[PDB]
Amino acid sequence: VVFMNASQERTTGRQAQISNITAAKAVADVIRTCLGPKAMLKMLLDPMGGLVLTNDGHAILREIDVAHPAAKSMLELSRTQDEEVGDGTTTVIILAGEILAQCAPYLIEKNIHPVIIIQALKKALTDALEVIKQVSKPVDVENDAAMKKLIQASIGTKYVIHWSEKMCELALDAVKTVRKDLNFEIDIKRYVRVEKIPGGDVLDSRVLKGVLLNKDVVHPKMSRHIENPRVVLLDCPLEYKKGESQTNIEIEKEEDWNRILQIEEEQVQLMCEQILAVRPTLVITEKGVSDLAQHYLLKGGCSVLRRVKKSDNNRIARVTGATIVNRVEDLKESDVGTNCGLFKVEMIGDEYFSFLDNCGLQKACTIMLRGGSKDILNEIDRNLQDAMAVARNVMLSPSLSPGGGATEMAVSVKLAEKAKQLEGIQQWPYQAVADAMECIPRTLIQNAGGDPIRLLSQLRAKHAQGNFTTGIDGDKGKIVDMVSYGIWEPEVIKQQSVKTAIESACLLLRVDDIVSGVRK
Amino acid sequence: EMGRPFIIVKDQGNKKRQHGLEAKKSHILAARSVASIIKTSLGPRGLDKILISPDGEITITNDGATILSQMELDNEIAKLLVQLSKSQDDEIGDGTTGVVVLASALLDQALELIQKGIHPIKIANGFDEAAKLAISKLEETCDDISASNDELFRDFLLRAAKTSLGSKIVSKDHDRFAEMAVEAVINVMDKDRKDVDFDLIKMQGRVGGSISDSKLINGVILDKDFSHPQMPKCVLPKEGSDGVKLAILTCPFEPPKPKTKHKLDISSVEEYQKLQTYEQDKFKEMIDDVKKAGADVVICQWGFDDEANHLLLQNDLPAVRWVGGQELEHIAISTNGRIVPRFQDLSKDKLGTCSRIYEQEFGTTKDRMLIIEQSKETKTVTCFVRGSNKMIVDEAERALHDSLCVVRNLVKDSRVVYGGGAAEVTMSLAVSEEADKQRGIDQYAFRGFAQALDTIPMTLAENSGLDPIGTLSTLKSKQLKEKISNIGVDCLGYGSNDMKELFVVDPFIGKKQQILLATQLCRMILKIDNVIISGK
Amino acid sequence: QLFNNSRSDTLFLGGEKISGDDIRNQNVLATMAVANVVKSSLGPVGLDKMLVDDIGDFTVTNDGATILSLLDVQHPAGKILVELAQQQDREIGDGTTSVVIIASELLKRANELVKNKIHPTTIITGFRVALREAIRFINEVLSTSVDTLGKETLINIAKTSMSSKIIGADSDFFSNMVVDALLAVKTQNSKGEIKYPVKAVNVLKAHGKSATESLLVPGYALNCTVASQAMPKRIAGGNVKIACLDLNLQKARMAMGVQINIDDPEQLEQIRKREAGIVLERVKKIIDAGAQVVLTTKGIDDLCLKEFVEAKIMGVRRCKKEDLRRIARATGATLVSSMSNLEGEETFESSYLGLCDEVVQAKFSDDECILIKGTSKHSSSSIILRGANDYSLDEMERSLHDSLSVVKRTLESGNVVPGGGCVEAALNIYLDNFATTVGSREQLAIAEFAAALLIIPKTLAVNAAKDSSELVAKLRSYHAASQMAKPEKRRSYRNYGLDLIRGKIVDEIHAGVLEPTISKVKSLKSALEACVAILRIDTMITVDPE
Amino acid sequence: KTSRGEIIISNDGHTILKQMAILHPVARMLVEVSAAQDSEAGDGTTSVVILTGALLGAAERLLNKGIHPTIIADSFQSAAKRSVDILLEMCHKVSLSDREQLVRAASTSLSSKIVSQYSSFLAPLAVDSVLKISDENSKNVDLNDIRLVKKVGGTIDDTEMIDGVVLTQTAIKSAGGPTRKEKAKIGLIQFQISPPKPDTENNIIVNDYRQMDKILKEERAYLLNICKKIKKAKCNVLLIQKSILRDAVNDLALHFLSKLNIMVVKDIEREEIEFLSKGLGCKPIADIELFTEDRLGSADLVEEIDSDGSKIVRVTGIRNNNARPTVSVVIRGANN
């Protein structure tokens, strides 16, 4: 009989709560060294063989296979922070892992029901958002010098801090190019193109507005340099089109077979005449190009590029302003790309690269990153996406909050004053969030080589003096305020980090049993 | 189960449990398989069965006690019927095949009552009350034969002998077997015709010759021959004599030695020469003590050295060697002698007396066996059986053994009945008559016990090729018309269903145990509910 | 239990056949093994459970409907409660946790009733006669939906369903969303009868922010991606025309199994050009009609994408068939499978186009959805859930789905009963005096039926890690005195239940906990049929597969 | 529990013996004993098995008593024939239609069935089903006219007799134009509705691009001309056979029928036409030329009621009133 075929034996009670808390703490313990400007790096080995070396929180979690079911929920928390914002993925797990670590001596010790704690976690979440809103100050979003110091917040931890002066100029012009007036700037990562070119120097880089294609020219006579280029995008292949009806031709007369091949040559010549009506200087298609259509376009000076990526055509239409039209009969002068210039094919031994330079507010840009190796170049790509994600929340809302240990401790001090005034059953779980916000500033000291005992003891005494700007230095470990050094981070990063940790803690505290063998 | 192994008792999956109606059906069918085997061998028209032993030896018998003893079974209910016939053979020794058929007949009638919703204890309570009503009824019908003299008392012993000799192999010689079985008790018995000792009669089988050579010999039959066979085989007494003066000695002929381990140290040649004379003086002294006592044949338990072969040959003293200790007890009883522990205690009053001591050649080679005869009535009777097959010599032992068990039961006073199915029919109608007066819930209990007693007469009609319906209806109609209980089934078909004219006689103590062993065993079987049988 | 029975003695069966009390003992263990799961999940103090497929994915499900669906139970009688939990979703939609615990308790207490030798027909009759009086008693103790001046009902109706769920602490925020969502999607049929098409409210999965910030969409939200990126992302202005077409816009082969044979080679090109031209004829009628949004069930070929960008029309492909039917009624458009009419001519009529206030496509956490708001003809609603991960939103998806079914029963039938063990405890005192009248052998069967309903209020206190006796003993004090409360409101003594948070007995009307009356009628009848079928099985026969 | 996984709980002894596989050769003969009891009388399949096993137990003791088996067999046949005349004197004849004798005998015949507690409204249900077919010749009363349709979900208390023919399958709903139909004529379509094709392989050759313009119009004109003849006869309900060989419905055909608000239900069993034709009083139409108003029947209400997830199509009333009617009962229950 066996009754249930899936986990007929059951683990319930405190045994299931310990397994959920211990596994959740193990997720945050491995990334403790990944927090702070002195943070180390972690290397990951996939079954495919590709090596990923980074200090990013999300990149470490998603590439590790965790057999513990409840600990897998910790792996998806960084995806929520990465997809919505992209910055702060490491502090989410450290905070959420510390909550369950602090909430452990309750169900076992105080015997407090989880829902009673959940009601306290929701009330502490509302008060935490108010403290973060009070410590946040607005700044000018149109100041270019002010936004350069904000991008350096996430760069200070990353290895690109040496190039930070150069990297901020790359990320600033990239977000400003794709943004447009309409929900405010509505910028999207899909419009920003980051191309990875092995070799070169990181110090030498530039933001290019256009699309960088690795495809070569289809014919040697094609001019690789055009003063005033004209781009016309065509989804239809220049090869002879065949009907899907599977038409079978019965040939009887001797002149019927010779005429079929001639008509195939006349239509290819006819489709070229429809293109030459607007006289484009450039031709770009996403499919193959026949060798017959190449000669007819040599007289008009039409450079043809074949097998272009589908998503790249939409990025060409933004910079060049051309309209994608599948049929050659609807081609008009308005559909021809305009304002584009500086078309040149630079010769590099690895691949042929084509350049575009722009002179309907949506635009696109292609950032050319030159690293020392392919794997380091993969790191700058990830560091550039997180650098541009910081400028997004600054343009969405003017609110700007402190960082580096000041915001986390500013909430813990406000939670200590209200805790003593509750005088009830919810007083114990309400104090768990106050001690949970201390892990982030404590980790910054442990990675800096300082003494967390004496620094955090005097740190809480400073916040009681009425100033919320007191942080923790990452190098010297000084208690000096963050206004002097200039660490500031968007409030959205601080809000999404606290909201995700509270919602995740309430999920794992409600699991009283773990069963397997379902095989859905 | 909740997900954890639940084991109350070690070897959980090995042992099985039976309960409910399926547990009762398996117990009844287990007895029906044993019954249908025994029902074929019941009655003088029955047939024997071959018993193959794991060692290769075979046994052919119809005896329910012997068949079930060597039978390898599995179910424990069928093993309870094994000791049922064993209980019948050990005490009474007669009716071993009838207790199995009667017990299964009680279980067959009980299965029909269980399906009707009757509690098993109510079924067992009805069989216990019906068993005493049948015994008390047959006890009033029988008569006491003790008023007859010793001349007629021998006739009643010949009547019950010929009945027990039937149904078994070599039943053509039963006429002479019945005569020899009674004469053994005539010679060995108490003067008051009571409490005869059965152990004084020994059963000694011999393989060879024919069955017609079986005869009674009063004395001791030993497998050992005369030592140093230069002496005459047949020993004859002196012209005038009181007897042969048989001597029995449990001490071998040796120079005296301590029982404890001893060390005899000879420190000089003179001490060694004295041992030479001391050696021959003892062998000369031991042979003179027998000659002065007048003894002739000397029996030794441990034998003797070759020194005394010629010594006893000069004095014409027969001697045997390596006689078992159990046989020495058998020798002193026949000759009425006394075992002499040592030559210093040897006297003429302790010597045994028998008529003649001789040996038989038997077959071609075989072995030499000694035979002793008595000149008058003694306390020892040895049975002598011959046969042309090893299986015949074997079964004939227990065939006459069971015949002696019937005669020794007749030694008990004032118990006799007539067999041939006349006892079961008389006791059947007495139980069915009480069922109409009692009524109640036990009315069906007396019916099941009455139908079970009629199975034995109906089984006799099956082996004889008769109609069990027409035979049982004739017996029941005869007991209602007339009070004579002597009408029964005839499997030999000589006519005259009256048992008085056919002389068939059975012991009442044997028939009384058949009802007691069958009823009391079914009372325990019907109480069995949970059956736990461990795997072998 | 104990030692296994012998295998087919004289019965000669190829499978296993067990008879006697061993079948009814294993049938109880089948319902008790599946109950211990559903037990700890009952009540606001219940805790969620995690099921694993061994493939690396986990499933968090509070209610026993999906739990018993995922867990494989090969026991013949164990599949009854599995199908019963799956059934409870079909009729009422809520109560899958209570129907399994009650049905398992009816069989548990009946296991000692058969040891009395009482025949199941006496046990079944005792449960049915007590049920006929129980359904009538529930209709006597029901309360009207009028109550005070304002509604003060539908807000409290949802709060009861939000209990036992992770969003139960946020139930105050989600109470106004469920009520406003069902009232917008209401329809009319049967000449005045109002119907509530549950599942018409779209449930979207988004990441980030918090569950408390989830915004109720005043209209339908379609989950899909934009056809071409060159199309305008936001469409403004009033009277936005929407076209819903079930016809393929991609180029398709001529007929199905025919063959195209061409003799004159000059017609080889002209015949192929017509195949691509017929497809664009249906697009030309849409552009001239002024349709801003074109919704297509199947995909859209690149031939139709160039006409939508030039005309500033938003195309949408790969639409669900059930999603477009709700868009047609809400926006007022008529579903068009093909362009044709009674006449032989083919043309497109402007009446098939809908109207709304605004059409905008929102993108949050890789989830792209088109927000259709301000439908003039018929209003609609959509709920965008935000949580930790997809599996965290899987429980929130079924949490709001059960809340839509509870509110539906209160609007159709205004009769509601208080929760927290009010109905289960009130039926005990009513059946205590009723069993003494019948007597004979049915008095014990009715008495055990009233005690079997006590498992629901007692489970609340066990899962709360508190003392169950003091809560139940004080509970009976109000109900035992309610039958004897006698006429004269000053009666009171009724509609009281357990408060698990504060550990006190308070009025459920002022506490805001109410449950539909029809939920009690369908639960007791469905839980009894599961117990009746089990009590009637004398022998289980299992045939081995060939 | 069967070998394929199907689990059947049956009180009837015939299904108990049929679903159970017996290894003994003679013990399987009892399975066919209940088959003869269920095929002729239909009641007493459990008792006839017990009576057979009881006679074997009584004849078992007769074998050891010296009676030949043929004598035992000939004695039972002589006693069984005498037992028939015993019941002929005790039985009492009843009137053609009596509510007292038929209802009390129907509820008693249920006995241990689970419907015994539900027998209150079920006893008149089985009586009124047979009373609709009355004959003086005492015919076997074929049960094909009585259709018991099973639906998953609900309770047995909801089981009631339907005043008209019920449809097991649901509506196509692809077009789904009509929600509900009142005073409609139910049609029966034995042919296929599709673009014109022979039942055998055909070929269509297109030699000119202007020919395809006439093809798409004429393929829709054929489906249009079919809807014209249906509209002239005012047939709002159509029923189409499965037609696995040729497509029964088409997207172009369902759009034409949606304009006229004609409800169509497909995937109907072929053997159910006798229940559809006699119950609804509608002559099946196998040809578009044979379609007329005289072959169409009449129905008051044709609707599909979705209750607790269970969708069912019911028809209320039949105005034809032909020689003999049919019985339609929908069965509901919690457990399948």
Ligand SMILES: Nc1ncnc2c1ncn2[C@@H]1O[C@H](COP(=O)(O)OP(=O)(O)O)[C@@H](O)[C@H]1O
């Ligand atoms: N020089 C520094 N001094 C003090 N704090 C720093 C310094 N550099 C970085 N930090 C803090 O360390 C944190 C690490 O940020 P980062 O690694 O980019 O993502 P995450 O915050 O998810 O770990 C930042 O939030 C920042 O406040």
Ligand SMILES: Nc1ncnc2c1ncn2[C@@H]1O[C@H](COP(=O)(O)OP(=O)(O)O)[C@@H](O)[C@H]1O
């Ligand atoms: N020659 C005979 N005539 C009539 N009845 C006999 C005869 N021999 C045996 N019987 C009956 O058969 C029964 C069984 O006898 P038998 O099989 O010889 O030994 P046991 O009594 O040990 O089974 C006895 O009860 C006896 O009454």
Ligand SMILES: Nc1ncnc2c1ncn2[C@@H]1O[C@H](COP(=O)(O)OP(=O)(O)O)[C@@H](O)[C@H]1O
């Ligand atoms: N706020 C509350 N206070 C007390 N009891 C409640 C409360 N909410 C629900 N209950 C009780 O919990 C039981 C289960 O409710 P619910 O979770 O909505 O159904 P299910 O457990 O089937 O999902 C109900 O019978 C109700 O009486």
Ligand SMILES: [Mg+2]
């Ligand atoms: Mg960062």
Ligand SMILES: [Mg+2]
């Ligand atoms: Mg004998």
Ligand SMILES: [Mg+2]
């Ligand atoms: Mg619920």
Ligand SMILES: [Mg+2]
């Ligand atoms: Mg019946």
